[PDB]
């Protein structure tokens, strides 16, 4: 399950 | 604190530089210093705070999972357990630091829905990370603290933000992950992701091209989870 | 030191775990503790020491280059310079730490060619990283220290190791980068890379399949540089 | 120019 990712 | 002699604006500028240099520990320290100046944070500043700590704790969580996997295989010297414990304690310290900033005094000063929801989502997330490593004792209480923060954020977001708002969408995404991965409630996770996706779809017609891109990007993450869970 | 109460074997075990968890700062601290136990390092232990510090300083160098580029564009408030200086000082401290381990007392105790060449190559590399950020004052002296370490390593490697030995090859590769990037001697860089590549090619017939794979991998890096430089 | 890389 994916949560909001860290920025780019 | 450690950043007490640096100007607020200089801390913010250096956090942006640290992000560009992929120096996330430095970024988080600069943003902690900025929060401790005592002024509320703008939208951009809240994002810098969240990005910094999400990257720091994300690396700690990845390392903890590698070590926890090795330790479990070893249990089927004390060194693997000791080192997993060291990483775990460091991770817990970062989560406690973030939660302390939210409690002193970001949440209580946040009156607009956008800021209050953002900070309550963070509070849910950092309790969720504490829950990932917790074992039985206050594990239940940590889980309830995450749930309570996410629920208050959900209640505000449903009353005050459109269904396509990116923070409302990311809150729902992360609360659905909480239900699936932490609270052992996969049906609640699936229901929340589906309802969130469908209500956002029905509101896309109101958006500009740029807002449409922002909202559909998070909707795709909800869909990706639903595909994995069903 | 900070690791004085931990057993040598436990420090080595934890360095291997830290590598698996991609916790290179921890890895370097464990290996520093192991070196400070005072015993010589095995081949595998030397690799752990080098991998740990190469990754720590590699991240610092990448961040320094991002910040130095921003600073140069700004020069065509004090914050970018201040933050570049902070990263630079941290990088210099890591290089000084490695050089101090080599001087106290890894190099003087290293009698076999494999260990002495390995440590002298490291000494060249860490002076080279100091040279990348040095500006005029002891910049010349830092460059000469790198050159002298690499040259002693080259002299030993040519007398004591076959031309396909991976440490001999990597030493030549890194000394060629020194010539090109630091010493403003691109012709010397090209000559060294070409001669090293050709002498290794002529010795491949002596190798097993596994040694052939090890040597040809580094030869390809020499070829990649020659293609970029010519 | 590439030097010896860090491990994998």
- Show the 3-state SS of chain C: CCCCCCCHHHHHHHHHHHHHCCCHHHHHHHHHHHHCCCCCCCHHHHHHHHHHHHHHHHHHHHHHHHHHHHHHHHCCCCHHHHHHHHHHHHHHHHHHHHHHHHHHHHHHHCCCHHHHHHHHHHHHHHHHHHHHHCCCCCHHHHHHHHHHHHHHHHHHHHHHCCCCCHHHHHHHHHHHHHHHHHCCCHHHHHHHHHHHHHHHHCCHHHCCHHHHHHHHHHHHHHHHHHHHHC
Tokens of C148: 């002298």
Residues C75, B27, B102, B146: is their CA dihedral positive or negative?
Answer: positive
Cα B111-B116-B121 angle, rounded to 5 deg:
175
Q: Does B6 touch chain C (CB under 8 A)?
A: no
Residues C190-199: contacts with CB under 8 Å, at least 24 apart: C190/C226, C190/C229, C190/C230, C193/C222, C193/C225, C193/C226, C193/C229, C194/C226, C196/C163, C196/C169, C196/C172, C196/C222, C197/C222, C197/C223, C197/C226, C199/C163
Asked, for residue C1, whether it belongs to a domain, the answer is: no
Residues B191-199: contacts with CB under 8 Å, at least 24 apart: B193/B222, B193/B225, B193/B226, B193/B229, B194/B226, B196/B163, B196/B169, B196/B172, B196/B222, B197/B222, B197/B223, B197/B226, B199/B163
Q: Does B43 touch chain C (CB under 8 A)?
A: no
Asked, for residue B35, whether it belongs to a domain, the answer is: yes
Asked, for residue B43, whether it belongs to a domain, the answer is: yes
Q: Distance (Å) from the C-alpha of residue B78 to the closest C-alpha of chain A?
A: 32
Total tally of structural domains belonging to chain B = 1
Q: What is the DSSP string of B194-217?
A: HHHHHHHHTTGGGS-HHHHHHHHH
What phi, psi does B97 have (nearest 5°)?
Answer: -65, -50
DSSP state of B136: S
Q: How many CB atoms lie within 10 A of CB C76?
A: 4
| CA distance linking residue B153 with residue B124, whole number of Å | 9
Q: Distance (Å) from the C-alpha of residue D8 to the closest C-alpha of chain C?
A: 9
Q: How many CB atoms lie within 10 A of CB B8?
A: 16
C27 in helix, strand or coil?
A: helix
Residue B54, CB-side half-sphere exposure with 13 Å CA sphere: 19
Note whether B79 contacts C13, CB cutoff 8 Å: yes
Tokens of C60: 């610092």
What phi, psi does B162 have (nearest 5°)?
Answer: -70, 160
Tell me which of A1, A7, A8 to substitute to probe the interface with B (most B C-beta atoms closer than 10 Å). A1
Residue C193, CB-side half-sphere exposure with 13 Å CA sphere: 29
Whats the size of chain B, residue-wise? 230
Q: What dihedral do alpha carbons B32, B38, B43, B47 form, nearest 10°?
A: 10
| CA distance linking residue B30 with residue B15, whole number of Å | 6
| CA distance linking residue B107 with residue B40, whole number of Å | 10
Specify whether the CB–CB gap between C85 and B26 falls below 8 A.
no
Q: What is the DSSP string of C143-187?
A: HHHHHHHHHHHHHHHHHHS-TT-HHHHHHHHHHHHIIIIISS-HH
Tokens of C27: 């890895």
DSSP state of B161: S
Specify burial of residue C220 (Cβ count, 10 A radius: 0-12, 13-18, 19+): exposed
Q: Which residue of A has its CA nearest to B229?
A: A1
Specify whether the CB–CB gap between B173 and B225 falls below 8 A.
yes
Tell me which of D3, D5, D7 to substitute to probe the interface with C (most C C-beta atoms closer than 10 Å). D3
Range of the domain at C198: 8-229
Q: Which residue of A has its CA nearest to B22?
A: A8
Residue C17, CB-side half-sphere exposure with 13 Å CA sphere: 29
Asked, for residue C175, whether it belongs to a domain, the answer is: yes
Specify burial of residue B186 (Cβ count, 10 A radius: 0-12, 13-18, 19+): middle
For C124-145, letters b (16+ CB in 10 Å) and e give bbbbbbbbbbbeeeeeeebbeb
Q: Which residue of C has its CA nearest to B11?
A: C79
| CA distance linking residue C46 with residue C42, whole number of Å | 6
Query: Rounded to an integer, what is the distance from CA C175 to the centroid of its chain?
Result: 10
Asked, for residue B2, whether it belongs to a domain, the answer is: no
Q: What dihedral do alpha carbons B127, B131, B135, B140 form, nearest 10°?
A: 70
CA distances from B40 to B105, B115, B181 (A): 9, 9, 33
Asked, for residue C102, whether it belongs to a domain, the answer is: yes
Specify whether the CB–CB gap between C55 and C63 falls below 8 A.
no
| CA distance linking residue B3 with residue B37, whole number of Å | 9
DSSP state of A1: -
Specify whether the CB–CB gap between C133 and C89 falls below 8 A.
no
Asked, for residue C40, whether it belongs to a domain, the answer is: yes
Segment 50-69 of chain B within 8 Å of chain C by CB: 59, 62-63, 66-67
Chains interfacing with C (3 or more CB pairs < 8 Å): B, D
> What CATH code is carried by the domain that includes residue B36?
1.20.190.20
Look at the block and give the residue holding tokens 């005592």.
B38
| CA distance linking residue C45 with residue C57, whole number of Å | 19
Experimental method: X-ray
Asked, for residue B1, whether it belongs to a domain, the answer is: no
Look at the block and give the residue holding tokens 């491990």.
D7
Residues C154-157: contacts with CB under 8 Å, at least 24 apart: C156/C113, C156/C116, C156/C117, C156/C120, C157/C113, C157/C117
| CA distance linking residue C7 with residue B82, whole number of Å | 13
For B107-145, letters b (16+ CB in 10 Å) and e give beebeebbbbbbbbbbbbbbbbbbbbbbeeeeeeebbeb
Q: Distance (Å) from the C-alpha of residue A5 to the closest C-alpha of chain B?
A: 8
| CA distance linking residue C60 with residue C185, whole number of Å | 25
Largest Cα–Cα separation, chain D: 20
| CA distance linking residue C203 with residue C211, whole number of Å | 11
| CA distance linking residue B39 with residue B109, whole number of Å | 9
């Amino acid at each position: 399950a994916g949560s909001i990712p860290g920025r780019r | 604190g450690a950043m007490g002699s640096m100007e607020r604006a200089s801390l913010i500028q250096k956090a942006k530089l640290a992000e560009q240099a992929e120096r996330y520990e430095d970024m988080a320290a600069f943003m902690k210093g900025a929060v401790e100046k005592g002024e509320e944070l703008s939208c951009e500043e809240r994002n810098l705070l969240s990005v910094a700590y999400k990257n720091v704790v994300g690396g700690q969580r990845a390392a903890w999972r590698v070590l926890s996997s090795i330790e479990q295989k070893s249990n089927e010297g004390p060194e693997v357990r000791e080192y997993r414990e060291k990483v775990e304690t460091e991770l817990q310290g970062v989560c406690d630091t973030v939660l302390g900033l939210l409690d002193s005094h970001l949440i209580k000063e946040a009156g607009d829905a956008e800021s209050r929801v953002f900070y309550l989502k963070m509070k849910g997330d950092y309790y969720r990370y504490l829950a990932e490593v917790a074992t039985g004792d206050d594990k239940k209480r940590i889980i309830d603290s995450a749930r309570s923060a996410y629920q208050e954020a959900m209640d505000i977001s449903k009353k005050e933000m459109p269904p396509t708002n990116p923070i409302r969408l990311g809150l729902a995404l992360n609360f659905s992950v909480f239900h699936y991965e932490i609270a052992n409630s996969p049906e609640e996770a699936i229901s929340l992701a589906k309802t969130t996706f469908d209500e956002a779809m029905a509101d896309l017609h109101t958006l500009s091209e740029d807002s449409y891109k922002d909202s559909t990007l998070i909707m795709q993450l909800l869909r990706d989870n639903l595909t994995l869970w069903t």
